């Protein structure tokens, strides 16, 4: 609930940044 | 209209994962370190372009407010389908449809958070709705929708 959404957010952010 | 301390704590934790040396700025070396641990190969120049987008004061690095800006733009604009599948693929390392307790532990270590083995299982059991001790794709999606 902090653990999952935090890990997901950073993974998703890194996924977005690489284009 | 407020901002809670655990919200602030969540941003601080994310920021600190990138800012490895704790000096209050994220460099291209640091941004690249995180992305590389998550299975990507950004060039130095690509990393610099990433910073440039949000580098409001122009100093070549990302401070805390600039990183908040980054999350507002990148960590919410795209992201719906076929790329939440990419995010799950990072968790589900070997690609068998199930995030094991050990695979979850492997993602957290690659992000920077070296949590205990006990705390890893506490996460699993949180998202584990069908009882098999693992997190399939559907349970991952439902974990992302709750508080
Ligand atoms: Ca730093
Ligand atoms: Ca800056
Ligand atoms: Ca797996
Ligand atoms: Ca399960």
Round to whole Å and give the CA distance between B41 and B59: 24
Size of interface A-B (CB pairs under 8 A): 74
Determine the Cα–Cα distance for residues B108 and B99; give it in Å rounded to an integer: 12
Our CA-based measurement puts residue A14 at a distance from the nearest CA of chain B, in whole angstroms, of 6
Separation in Å, CA of A2 to nearest CA in chain B:
7
Residues 6+ apart with CB under 8 A from B18: B26, B30, B31, B34, B62, B67
Subunit contact B87:A3, Cβ cutoff 8 A: no
d(C-alpha B103, C-alpha B83), whole Å: 19
| B14·A7 Cβ contact <8 A | no
- Cβ neighbours of residue B113 under 8 Å, at least 6 residues apart? A7, B13, B17
What was the elucidation method? X-ray
Q: What is the resolution of this structure in A?
A: 2.0
The CATH class given to the B81-145 domain equals mainly alpha
Say if B4-80 and B81-145 have the same CATH topology: yes
How many Å lie between the centroid of ligand 3 and the Cα of residue B102? 9
Per domain, the residue ranges of chain B are 4-80, 81-145
CA separation for the pair B89, B60 (Å, rounded): 32
Domain B4-80 in CATH 3.30.565.10? The answer is no
**B45 burial class (0-12, 13-18, 19+ CB within 10 angstroms)?**
exposed
- 3-class secondary structure for chain B? CCCCHHHHHHHHHHHHHHCCCCCCCECHHHHHHHHHHCCCCCCHHHHHHHHHHHCCCCCCCECHHHHHHHHHHCCCCCCCCCCHHHHHHHHCCCCCCEECHHHHHHHHHHHCCCCCHHHHHHHHHHHCCCCCCCEEHHHHHHHCCCC
């Amino acid at each position: 609930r902090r653990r999952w959404k935090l890990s997901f957010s950073i993974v998703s952010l890194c996924n977005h940044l690489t284009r | 209209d407020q901002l809670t301390e655990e919200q602030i704590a969540e941003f601080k934790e994310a920021f600190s994962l990138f800012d490895k040396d704790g000096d209050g700025t994220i460099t291209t070396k640091e941004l690249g370190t995180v992305m590389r641990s998550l299975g990507q190969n950004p060039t130095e120049a690509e990393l610099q372009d990433m910073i440039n987008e949000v580098d409001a004061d122009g100093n070549g690095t990302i401070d805390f407010p600039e990183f908040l800006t980054m999350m507002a733009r990148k960590m919410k604009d795209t992201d719906s389908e076929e790329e939440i599948r990419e995010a799950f693929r990072v968790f589900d390392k070997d690609g068998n449809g199930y995030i094991s307790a050990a695979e979850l532990r492997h993602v957290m270590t690659n992000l920077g958070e070296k949590l205990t083995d006990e705390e890893v299982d506490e996460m699993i059991r949180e998202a584990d709705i069908d009882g098999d001790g693992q997190v399939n794709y559907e349970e991952f999606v439902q974990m992302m929708t709750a508080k």
